[PDB]
Structures are given as C-alpha cells and as structure tokens.
Amino acid sequence: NYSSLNRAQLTFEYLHTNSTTHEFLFGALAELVDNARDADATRIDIYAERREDLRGGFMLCFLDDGAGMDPSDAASVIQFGKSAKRTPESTQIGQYGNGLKSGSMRIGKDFILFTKKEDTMTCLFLSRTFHEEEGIDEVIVPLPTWNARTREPVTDNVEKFAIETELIYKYSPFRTEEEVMTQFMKIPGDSGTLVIIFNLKLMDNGEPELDIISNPRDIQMAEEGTKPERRSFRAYAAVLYIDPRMRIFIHGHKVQTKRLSCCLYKPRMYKYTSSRFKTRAEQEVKKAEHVARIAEEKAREAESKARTLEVRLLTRDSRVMLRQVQNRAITLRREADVKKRIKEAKQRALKEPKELNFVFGVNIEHRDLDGMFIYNCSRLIKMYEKVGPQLEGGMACGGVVGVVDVPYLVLEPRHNKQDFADAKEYRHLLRAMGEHLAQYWKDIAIAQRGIIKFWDEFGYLSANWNQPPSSELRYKRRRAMEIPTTIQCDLCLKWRTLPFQLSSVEKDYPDTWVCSMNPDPEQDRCEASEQKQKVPLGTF
Amino acid sequence: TNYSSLNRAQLTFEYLHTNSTTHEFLFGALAELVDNARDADATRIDIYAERREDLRGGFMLCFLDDGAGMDPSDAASVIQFGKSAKRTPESTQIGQYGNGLKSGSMRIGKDFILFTKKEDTMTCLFLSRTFHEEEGIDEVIVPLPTWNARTREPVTDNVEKFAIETELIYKYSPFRTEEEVMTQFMKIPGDSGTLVIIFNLKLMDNGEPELDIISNPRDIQMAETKPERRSFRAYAAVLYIDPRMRIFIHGHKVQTKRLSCCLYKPRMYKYTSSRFKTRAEQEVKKAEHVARIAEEKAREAESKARTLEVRLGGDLTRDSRVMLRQVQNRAITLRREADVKKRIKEAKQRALKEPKELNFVFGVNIEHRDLDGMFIYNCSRLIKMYEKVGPQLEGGMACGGVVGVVDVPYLVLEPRHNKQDFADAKEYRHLLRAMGEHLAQYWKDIAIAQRGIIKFWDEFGYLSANWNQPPSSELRYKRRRAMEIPTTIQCDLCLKWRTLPDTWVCSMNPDPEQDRCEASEQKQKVPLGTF
Ligand SMILES: Nc1ncnc2c1ncn2[C@@H]1O[C@H](COP(=O)(O)OP(=O)(O)NP(=O)(O)O)[C@@H](O)[C@H]1O
Ligand SMILES: Nc1ncnc2c1ncn2[C@@H]1O[C@H](COP(=O)(O)OP(=O)(O)NP(=O)(O)O)[C@@H](O)[C@H]1O
Ligand SMILES: [Mg+2]
Ligand SMILES: [Mg+2]
Ligand SMILES: [Zn+2]
Ligand SMILES: [Zn+2]
C-alpha cells in the first residue's frame, strides 16, 4: 500500500508552461481538430461567437458530431498523459494525453467544453481567470453532469455539484443553467462535443492574435512574406490530413479540403524501402514472441499443477484449494491465448512491404508553393520543406510538391506535433526524398521540351517566379485540363472526380455538393463505389 | 467557498514520456540540468559517467554540483510541475517554467535518482519509471526520504512511509543498501550541493546508447556538422554568454568561453528595441496601479484609526482599548504593505529610464571561417546557434566568417518549452533582420575591402579554394592568427576572467595589475560602432 507516499502534482502555472510548446498558433487549433477526427466526427464547425465583454471580443468554438464523452471519459481529459488512443497499431492521431490542454491554453486564458454521449451530458470548465482571482495554485476543474433527457443533475454529491455549477455561472460566459443548456442543445445528435476557448490572447497593440474580420470566412493570423497555410486557417485546415473525410466548416462556410497528390500535374509515386521500418517491425514481433512465450510457460505451469493436484486429492479445504489452482490455470491460459493472437497479428503485419510512398507532382496553379509535405499517421507535421535539387539556386524541381505519410514506427512527433522527435532519421528521410525528387524530374523530362516553354504555356509570362499565373480564359482552362476537379459528397463523404466542363471553369462549388450533381454516369449516386484515384509508379 | 471536494487535474505515468518529447536535441536535455546548477550558484559542475554493465546503456550519467542544494521542502517542490520560485521580477535565473529537470531527465534515461544536501538535511528524490512499469502504477509516485546530515538519522513524520520509500530505493535504484546511499551523499563534499544520476539510458536501434563516452574519453558525443551539435564539450563551452561556473566532463575541465573574446576586431552596435520599451512601460503602469490601490486601502484604515480614537476619547474600558488596537495595527500593516509596493513601483520607474537597447556584437572568426552566423542568448542562456543573417543569406563571401552575439532579455523574447527556440516567431524574425542590417554595417566598418577580401583570408593561411577547409597549420600562419585574438583565461581558484599579453591561476599572469586573485576584474572593452 503506497497511499501515504508523495505524488507528482500539477500546479496552475504549468498550464502556461505546457502552452509554450506552440509557437505556431494554428498548431494549437490543430490539436482540437485532431481530437474531433479521432472521435469519428463527420463534421467539425470552427466558428466565432462575438462577445464584447470577453478578452479579444469573441469566443472560438469547435463543434463536432463525433462520439462524445461520458462522465468518466470527460474526467480523464484532466489526467495529463492519459490517452485510450495510445494502443499498438494506432491510426488515431492522439497519443500523448496533452493536446487539448497545450493547445487551448496557447489560444486563450480559459475554456469550457460541453459533451454528450448516450444518456449523459457533461461540462468541463478550465478557468485560469477563477484561479487568478481566488489565488488557487492547484488546478481545480468543475465537471458537472446532467441527464441528457430530463436535465436532472447526475451526481454523487449535491454540495459538490452546486459548487461546480456556481463556479461556471460566476466565471464562464454562461451565467445561468438555462444558458448552459442552450450550449448543450447545439450538439443536435446523439453525441458530440463543443469546445469554447475564450479570453483570447492579445498582441501588444491590444488586438487578438486571430483576425476573423478581414475575411469573415476565415481565421487569419493578425498581421506577402508568408505561405497561405501559415496565415489562413482555411488554407491550413484544407491540407491538415492526407486523407480527409471529416468535413470542416469555418464560420459556417465549407473548407475545400484536398488531397495534395490529386492537385498536381503528372503525379508519380516511388516506393522507398525503409530499413528502420523493417528493423523496428522485426523488434516489435520479437517482443511479442517473448511475451507470448513467457505467458505460455506460466499457463502450462498452472495447468500442470491443476492436473497433478487433482490426482493427489475430498475435504472442503482441499476442494477450495483445488478450485483455486484450476481457476488460476484457466485465467492464465486465456491470457496466454490473447498474447499469442497479438503476436500472430504482428507476424502477419511484418510480411507487408516495409516501404514509404513518396508522391511528387508539379504545382502548376502556384509554382512558388512547392517543397515537401510530411505527414505522420496522416497528420501534417512539416510543410514546404525543400529537398534535393530545390536546395540549389535553380529552376530544376522548382514547382514540385512532394507528399509522404510516415508511420509511427518510423517517426514520432515532437510535443507540439510540428516537428519530429528523431532529427537524425528525419534528416535521412529528407535526403532520400531529395534523391527521388531528382528522379521524378528526370521521369517527366521537362528538359526535353524546355522549362521556359512549359511554364509559359500555363500562363507564367512574368520573370517574377513568385507572381501568380495568368488569369485569362485560355490559361485557366489549360491548367484545368491537367488537374481533374475532385469534390466530396456532403451526404456520403465519398470523393468524386468531375469530368472537365468548360461552363464549370468560370465558377467554384457551393457549401453543398452531392453525388447526384456529378455529370459522370459512373459516379452519380451515393451508391456508386468510391473510385481510388491512382498514381503511376516510378522507379528510382 | 471550500473547494476540497472538487476535481484536480493530475499527472499520469505516461506524461513523463510526453513531456520528454520536447527535446529532439538531446544535448538540450542535458543543458536543463546544467542550467539548474548555474541557477543554484554552483562554482563547479562535474558531468561524468559511472560504469554499470547491469544498467541499460552500460553507465549512469551523473551531474554533481557544489551549488546551494535543497532542503526537504525545496526537494518536494521539484515534483510540483510548474512550480518555480525563480519566476520573480528582474529574475536573472534561467529557470522559469518549473519543468526542465523532469523534461530533460526523462529524455535522457528511464530513471533518475537525486541526492541533495543543505544545512543539516540531505534528501533523496527517486523517480523510477522501472518501478511504475513493474508494479503497474499509473500515478507518479516519488520516494522523498530525508536524513540528518550529521547523525544520519531519518527525519520523518511517518516511519512507516519512510520504510516504504527507502525500500523502494534499495529495490529499484542503483544503490541497494543504506551504506551505498550514504556513499552517494558523501560525494557532495561541502555544506551543500546536488548529485543527479540518470540511469537506464536510452538506446539506439543497434542497442548502443545515444551518448558515446568511448570514442573520446574526455567527452560526451552523439553516437551518430557543427561541433556543438555532436560534442558536449563544445556545446557546454558556449552555453552561457557570461560563464563563471566551471564545467568538467569526466574530470577534465571544459574551456568555457565568451564568444566575443575569441574573434577578430569585435565591435558592438546598440539597437533600440521598441518592443523592449513598450513592454517595460506596461510593467510599470501595472506596478503603479498596484501601489495606487494599496495606498488608498492604507489611507482608509489610517483614517478609521484616527476617527475611532477621537470618538473613543474618554473611554476607560478594556474593550474600547483592545478594539482600538485591532484597527490601529491593521492600519500599520496596510501602510507597510503600501510602502513596499510603492518601492517596487519606484524601482521599475527607475529601470524604465535605462536604455531599451539590445547589444549586437560581431567579430570575424579567423580560426574557423566556416563556423559563422549568429548566436542568440536569452538571459545569458544559448537558444540558437549558427543562424545566418543579412548578407550571409546570399551565396557570396560578404560577411562570411562573421560571428554575431546578442543577449535578449525575457521582456523582449521568452523561450519555447524546450529552450531551443523562441516562443514569438514574428518578433524573433524581426530581431534577425535587425541583426542582419547591423552585420552589413560591421562589415563596412572593418573595411576588409580596403585591404582586399581574398588577401585578408590569404594572410591568415586559407590556402585552399574551398570555403570548408581549415586554414594552414604552418607556424607563421598560426602566430599571424593568434596575434589578433587576445588570450583570455579564467582563474581556477577565484573564477575571475583575465587577459594575458590546462590549469591556470591569477598568479601566473605577467601583468602586474592582474597578478593576484584579489585584483579587480577588468571588463571587456568592445569598441562601439554606429548604424
Ligand atoms: N472532440 C472530442 N470528442 C471526443 N473526445 C475528446 C474530444 N476532445 C478530447 N477528447 C478526449 O480527451 C482525451 C484527451 O485529449 P487530448 O488532451 O488531445 O490528448 P489525446 O487526444 O488523448 N492525445 P494528444 O492529443 O496526442 O496529446 C482524448 O483522448 C479524448 O478521449
Ligand atoms: N541542482 C539543483 N540545485 C538546487 N535546486 C535545484 C537543482 N535542480 C533543481 N532544483 C530545484 O528544483 C526546481 C525545479 O527545477 P526544474 O524542473 O529544472 O524547473 P526550474 O528550473 O524552476 N524552471 P525550468 O527549468 O525553466 O522549468 C528548481 O526551481 C529548483 O528549486
Ligand atoms: Mg488529441
Ligand atoms: Mg530548471
Ligand atoms: Zn454522395
Ligand atoms: Zn585568481
């Protein structure tokens, strides 16, 4: 019994410490978007709610229709490091048990979260304002739960519930039970979550870091020196995931999420055999083989004992002791059989090709927006990273975008999910990408016809590399014929391609598009199987 | 109200790993522990290996300092994540986030055990992830036993607890008996100091430790390019802009240095920072509001005291008397509170009139022309190195070889979580541009073109055509280079920095004015340039 011993504890100032991991502010917002994706949301709405009485003048709200949280899931939010996602073979992005807390506290002083699942609804309130006003150095978190149908309190301690809710009514943006219930009503389905960050951080000039006024369909950094994804959250959100499904809306307006590899001229894929991937997968199998073997030894020991003890023995004493070893044998056999299945699954996975897929294509719409985009378990970590020939002063590989998805066995992310924890191996990957890039440039052979004429044809008349291509009617169409338009159905979440349509070059597409708007007979119903847009194979 | 029934946020075992992922640069994890020794006023830190083939990686990494140490309550606050007494106004401590020892140690190894002594106590703090894994503990449980430094009796309010704590140490730590633990405490020889031992070190895929102490037995190298990114001896030498604390690796002194003293024709440019000014102005306006409120409170309480005295005038009762002193003393306390705040307001007002300037220093690295660029310190601590700025961002020889140094106060920039970057990238980028413009000016000012840039480098013995190769080692070029760089050296005894016209001490100096440890320390006279 260790109950008397000292525990490590969190103090109030740690919330700030933790938040300093995010220099890139959009990386803090990404943590909340990641959590919605991980909860299987089909949509997330990121929107502002004007509140002149709160610091920065609005609250930033993240509303998803994912799985939500029951009361124990909600309580675990404040167990720093706790993540039910951290399982071997995770394709969830979350693994460190920190993102919501590091991200929210970078963005604002306070947050309040509402979540609904099955028959309960829970509020989690993290108020640094309360802590400062009352001189609290611990981290104290109100966590009231109500019945989702009756709205009655669900609590073991009515005095605690009254203190919890009064703290919410005193310090949060919602000053009555009725105002709180209005927030729970914004989660219209059976389940979902609403995170509201408020008292937003200010710049020196007293204005918020986030500008939602300049473009009321966007969230921008309040300050072109910058790539679009570093100043426009609409741009960043579109490419945050390599395989988007979840729809994203900003201030009610759909984000045109995209697969970068489908937005490029003449995409090509190269398989890179990864010695780390294979080495590490082998070591994982060996660990699981060991674990399974030891569990089998222990089960066989207990099974032997049950056999031998039974023959040796009927008093009630001997009956109870025989059953105790018989049940122990049964328990250990079931555990040994579970470890065996884990090991066998890992053995099967080991035989899959241990390769990374590099995809390259030319960004003819914005040739200055080039370099490598490096994803980790499908989540964007690094963008616009120049490699190989791009590191020289040349036109060689100018305009080429590269994409790769790196599994957790090959690389894990830093604390802020904007870098890689193993710099040596990351640099090795960049070197390999650079070599394959050079091969790509040979394989499309622009030198054959020239580069001065290639770019001229898509409307790049200026000698200013970073100037946009011509806007005229012939050049827009010429670029449009090379990159098929793809679009996601708002109903079924399938991705579809649209045949070129000269009447469609003039416009873009509304907040809604559905499969039955498609003119291709082969993909005009939600029922038509999703066609995988496939990338020709190159060799290095 | 009373909040005792309300939920608290808590730390779980896995968070120790999460926190450690901040340190991609492994030497930055080691630097956290060096910082703590510096902050504790250590005059010496020994970073050394103790061989232990039974522990993962084959050795334990030890950090032994002669700093102030920790009393038992100081030691207990180590595991209060975020707690930092160092977080004070005009704090010149590196520590501010209440995290570094925990993030750094858990990047380097699985487990650590710390021994510390201060006055008549000595405390062990044991963070064993091996224990947590073996017994399936999901909280973070930390033995913290204290003994009397002189008698070696336990100092504990709960002997049952103390027995459990020490039994955990003897079971899981590198030291299996009380005698072995006492041996570690005895490695702190003075009245105070701290020994941090990190063990079960992380391994690479090939089963070798990340830290290579074999290739060079006087160094700690990365087992895998700027010297400071592979040699800890190199990195430690430039970790602080104003080194005093001596650093030893495996018992061998590190030649710490002030980068501005190692360069040809160093020059200083003062840069007026609007950010610095505005933030200082706001820190004052806050202090003046705080002193204002306190004054009005004191003035009301003094008024009440006076009025109650005239009203009670003529009352003999014990009651009226005791009550009159409750009010009088309350007035006295508020007055002293108001006066203290008024003093801090005044001190911030005085500091506001100091110049709000950053000092950029540039000089030419004639010994190693390819090791150039800017070194950016934050309250004396190195954050970024070899950062190219201004004309260095071109493919030219202009400003090639120039090293720049600046110390940036917390008011202007604060560090990221891992102290290897800056929290405000916009402001950092602005600083780099300003440094670039001043670098161009420095280059004009030393007039390397008056003599010819090619001939300048020839004279110091750069025979080779490729920028990367070192200059010639012939004797005439060695002396040509050395003659341009004064020799500065630190006394092993008194810690002062000296100039001259291994072990070294003040009395070895031929300068009769610096030839004794009690002679006053001379300041670097870096000449001033203008933008
Ligand atoms: N929108 C959401 N819907 C459902 N569950 C959520 C949501 N946001 C947070 N959670 C839960 O809160 C837990 C902790 O969140 P978080 O602090 O992001 O750490 P994590 O998501 O587990 N891993 P990481 O984010 O990598 O540190 C998650 O594991 C989820 O169980
Ligand atoms: N070698 C040491 N000597 C004396 N005190 C120490 C030592 N190492 C750690 N401490 C104490 O432990 C506390 C926590 O250290 P640490 O975890 O490094 O946080 P910090 O140094 O306060 N600030 P930061 O390092 O910026 O997170 C310090 O504030 C000191 O009080
Ligand atoms: Mg997460
Ligand atoms: Mg520290
Ligand atoms: Zn559809
Ligand atoms: Zn001396």
Residue numbers in the entry:
A (entry chain B): 5 to 227, 231 to 320, 324 to 550
B (entry chain A): 4 to 227, 233 to 509, 521 to 550
Reproduce passages from the article.
Microrchidia CW-type zinc finger proteins (MORCs) are a family of transcriptional regulators conserved in eukaryotes. We recently showed that human MORC2 is necessary, in conjunction with the human silencing hub (HUSH), for silencing of transgenes integrated at chromatin loci with histone H3 trimethylated at lysine 9 H3K9me3. MORC2 is a 1032-amino acid protein predicted to contain several functional domains including an N-terminal GHKL-type ATPase module with a coiled-coil insertion (CC1). Here we report the biochemical and cellular activities of MORC2 variants, alongside structures of wild-type and neuropathic variant forms of a MORC2 fragment comprising the GHKL-type ATPase module and CW domain.
The effect of T424R on the crystal structure of MORC2 is more subtle. The backbone structures of wild-type and T424R are essentially identical, including in the loop that contains the mutation. The arginine sidechain in the mutant does make an additional salt bridge across the dimer interface, with Glu27 from the other protomer. Moreover, the buried surface area at the dimer interface is actually decreased upon the T424R mutation (2527 Å2 buried per protomer versus 2778 Å2 in wild type). The contribution of the mutant Arg424 sidechain to the dimer interface, and its position just three residues away from a key active site residue Lys427, can be expected to alter the ATP-dependent dimerization dynamics of MORC2. Indeed, we found that the T424R variant forms a mixture of monomers and dimers in the presence of AMPPNP, and shows an elevated rate of ATP hydrolysis. This suggests that T424R dimers may form and dissociate more rapidly than in the wild type. Conversely, T424R (which has increased ATPase activity in vitro) was significantly less efficient at GFP reporter repression than wild-type at both loci.
